[PDB]
A paper describes a structure:
In a double-blinded, placebo-controlled phase 1 human clinical trial, the recombinant, germline-targeting envelope glycoprotein (Env) trimer BG505 SOSIP.v4.1-GT1.1, adjuvanted with AS01B, induced bnAb precursors of the VRC01-class at a high frequency in the majority of vaccine recipients. These bnAb precursors, that target the CD4 receptor binding site, had undergone somatic hypermutation characteristic of the VRC01-class. The GT strategy for inducing VRC01-class bnAb precursors is rooted in the hypothesis that these antibodies target the CD4bs with a similar angle of approach to VRC01 and use the same conserved contact residues. To verify that VRC01-class mAbs elicited by GT1.1 do not just exhibit similar sequence features to VRC01-class bnAbs but also target the CD4bs in a similar manner and with the same atomic contacts, we selected five mAbs for further structural characterization.
One priming immunogen designed to bind to VRC01-class B cell precursors is the eOD-GT8–60mer, which consists of a modified and multimerized gp120 fragment. Moreover, VRC01-class bnAbs have very distinct and targetable genetic and structural characteristics. Specifically, they have restricted immunoglobulin heavy chain variable region alleles (IGHV1–2*02 or *04) and a short five amino acid light chain complementarity determining region 3 (CDRL3). First, VRC01-class bnAbs typically have a tyrosine at position 95 (Y95CDRL3) and a glutamic acid at position 96 (E96), which are important contact residues with the conserved Env loop D (N279Env/N280Env). Finally, GT1.1-induced VRC01-class mAbs are structurally extremely similar to VRC01-class bnAbs.
Residue numbers in the entry:
A (entry chain C): 1 to 169
B (entry chain H): 1 to 52, 52A, 53 to 82, 82A, 82B, 82C, 83 to 100, 100A, ...
C (entry chain L): 1 to 91, 96 to 212
């Protein structure tokens, strides 16, 4: 029971990683819905660096092969009320992403579901007892609108739409 | 020094789309987000979203998600806002706004703004204005000061600009707010008071610009 | 998310006195409140940022203070050029704004009347333009009479923004008739009434 992501070019199996964190943007403007919406960051490398949880691998939207938090999910932002500040999310338990060589990298649906649920709970501590929705990247250059990463000198691009499209109540 | 220049006013039909440009200069384009904020006529300010020009990321106000697209071209320091499926209550002046350096700073303290772009949503087409003199004589002279003007009639959509002697004459000018006629076309006057002694000796020209129809009219206003 | 409440929606003050505007934030926003001045037809202008700081080049009679949820913008001695609408802003949210207008002494208009141009008559319409120049208060009565017959229904009025220098208003009243009706009558007059004085300016259709 997997989330199987389409990636271009095909990442070989030894470019499989552990997802150890990710970076969000909270969607702005008024909602009379009691929802808070998050998308993969609309920032850039500077926001990724500021999280200080990357390892050696350079990647967008997801931190791959980075540091893990000690007990539970950790979220941090320079200013929670400012939708132009990215939100850093550090996992306590990593989620393996296994690439086949044949053009996809897959993750366990149940593990990603439980990850999003934990993240959503920490976000609820920060913005209130609200419904939490993850929605796809709002857009950007190819390396940032995709989950993209450098493996061994080659750049890979995984559509992350499946990872960020769900409601958490 | 820092400049932010927007494209000109437009009319668009309901359901159609508009793309407004915002060209910046005099600073590092990729170092500041560009935000769009719009103002319906005689209403407040309404934020639409931001674009990160470094890598193209965006964050749109929820009420415009699915209807707006923000892009940029770094090679010419230009940001764009494209709003689609226009409804009537999208008629408004659209501003781009540039905050102070977004790192450390809020990225919401808007230092510099563009001049704005009036987008009118309507089915009627553009119509350049007819310009008529409001000539000075001894009859428009009260105590050695004479009044003269230009009637700027039958145009659409807003706006027009009016200057006198290509902007060399500014004092005394009153360009009135446009009024919508029962024809659906706009009309206004711009007037100025000058000394009567100058009437025979200084020439007076009003310069009407209607960007929506790409028409500029210069009318020499001669004394009667 | 973060609501704002800006007070009052409009105020009227004499030159030189102190003007205070409040903005109440829905939740603790620290000191991240900005204050903008917007003149008619112009982009907003940043005056106060991060609730206290004076934007460079802003005159020092503009101050802001406050923290948490209650913020204050004040003009120490209102100047004539300070007519505007003022907005606080917290992140993407703008307050409702405050239109400050000036109170001053009564000023009587200079009144002028313009017959249709010869050019416009060719085209088949007549537009006769009555100007009330630099008066106060805004409230004025303008009536049109052709051959002493009150018109009532074929004129339109337009009023400037309050002048940034002398706090006066200017007004235009335009009477529009077809070339046919215009040539049917001789005396064209606009009657301008400001409180126990009516000034009537007029012309005879042919003369100049
Ligand atoms: C992440 O770590 C695994 C295990 O060490 C390694 O095989 C893989 O290449 C790394 N990912 C990238 C993108 O280099
Ligand atoms: C992920 O981490 C586990 C240990 O937590 C390790 O056994 C596994 O090989 C890692 N997977 C990848 C793809 O690096």
């Amino acid at each position: 029971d997997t989330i199987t992501l389409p990636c271009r070019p095909a990442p070989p199996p030894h470019c499989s990683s552990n997802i150890t964190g990710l970076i969000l943007t909270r969607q702005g403007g008024y909602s009379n819905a009691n929802t808070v919406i998050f998308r993969p960051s609309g920032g850039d490398w500077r926001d990724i660096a500021r999280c200080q949880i990357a390892g050696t691998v350079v990647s967008t939207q997801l931190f791959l092969n980075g540091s893990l938090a000690e007990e539970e999910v950790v979220i941090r932002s320079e200013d929670w009320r400012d939708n132009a500040k990215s939100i850093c999310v550090q996992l306590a338990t990593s989620v393996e992403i296994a690439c086949t060589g044949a053009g996809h990298c897959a993750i366990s649906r149940a593990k990603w579901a439980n990850t999003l649920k934990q993240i959503a709970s920490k976000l609820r501590e920060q913005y209130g007892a609200k419904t939490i929705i993850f929605k796809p990247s709002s857009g950007g250059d190819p390396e940032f609108v995709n989950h993209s990463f450098n493996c061994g000198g080659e750049f890979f691009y995984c559509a992350s739409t499946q990872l960020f499209a769900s409601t958490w109540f | 020094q820092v400049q932010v220049v927007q494209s000109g006013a437009e009319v668009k039909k309901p359901g159609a789309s508009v793309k407004v440009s915002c060209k910046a200069s005099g600073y590092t384009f990729t170092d500041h987000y560009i935000h769009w904020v719009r103002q319906a006529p005689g209403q407040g300010l309404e934020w639409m979203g931001w674009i990160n020009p470094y890598r193209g990321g965006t964050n749109y106000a929820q009420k415009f998600q699915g209807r707006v697209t923000m892009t940029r071209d770094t090679s010419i320091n230009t940001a764009y806002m494209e709003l689609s499926r226009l409804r009537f209550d999208d008629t408004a002046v659209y501003y781009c706004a540039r905050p102070k350096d977004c790192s450390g700073g809020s990225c919401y303290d808007f230092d510099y703004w563009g001049q704005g772009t009036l987008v009118t949503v309507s089915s009627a087409s553009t119509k350049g204005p007819s310009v008529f003199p409001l000539a000075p004589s001894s009859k428009s002279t009260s105590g050695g000061t004479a009044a003269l003007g230009c009637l700027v009639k039958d145009y659409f959509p807003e706006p027009v600009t009016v200057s006198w002697n290509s902007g060399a004459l500014t004092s005394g000018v009153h360009t009135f707010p446009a009024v919508l006629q029962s024809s659906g076309l706009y009309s206004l006057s711009s007037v100025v008071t000058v000394p009567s002694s100058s009437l025979g000796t200084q020439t007076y020209i009003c310069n009407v610009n209607h960007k929506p129809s790409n028409t500029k009219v210069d009318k020499r206003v001669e004394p009667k | 998310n973060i609501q704002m409440t800006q007070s009052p929606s409009s105020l009227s003050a004499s030159v030189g006195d102190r003007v205070t505007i409040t903005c109440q934030a829905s939740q603790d926003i620290s000191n991240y409140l900005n204050w903008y001045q917007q003149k008619p037809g112009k982009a907003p202008k940043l005056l106060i940022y991060d609730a206290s700081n004076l934007e460079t080049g802003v005159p020092s009679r503009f101050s802001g203070s406050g923290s948490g949820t209650h913020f204050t913008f004040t003009i120490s001695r209102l100047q004539p050029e300070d007519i505007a609408t003022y907005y606080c802003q917290v992140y993407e949210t703008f307050g409702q704004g405050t239109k400050v207008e000036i109170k001053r002494t009564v000023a009587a208009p200079s009144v002028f009347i313009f017959p249709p141009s010869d050019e416009q008559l060719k085209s088949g319409t007549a537009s006769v333009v009555c100007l009330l120049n630099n008066f106060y208060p805004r409230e004025a009565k303008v009536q049109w009479k052709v051959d002493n017959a009150l018109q009532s229904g074929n004129s339109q009025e337009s009023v400037t923004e309050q002048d940034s220098k002398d706090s006066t208003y200017s007004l235009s009243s335009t009477l529009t008739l077809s070339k046919a009706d215009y040539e049917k009558h001789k005396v064209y007059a606009c009657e301008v009434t400001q409180g126990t004085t009516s000034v009537t300016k007029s012309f005879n259709r042919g003369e100049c």
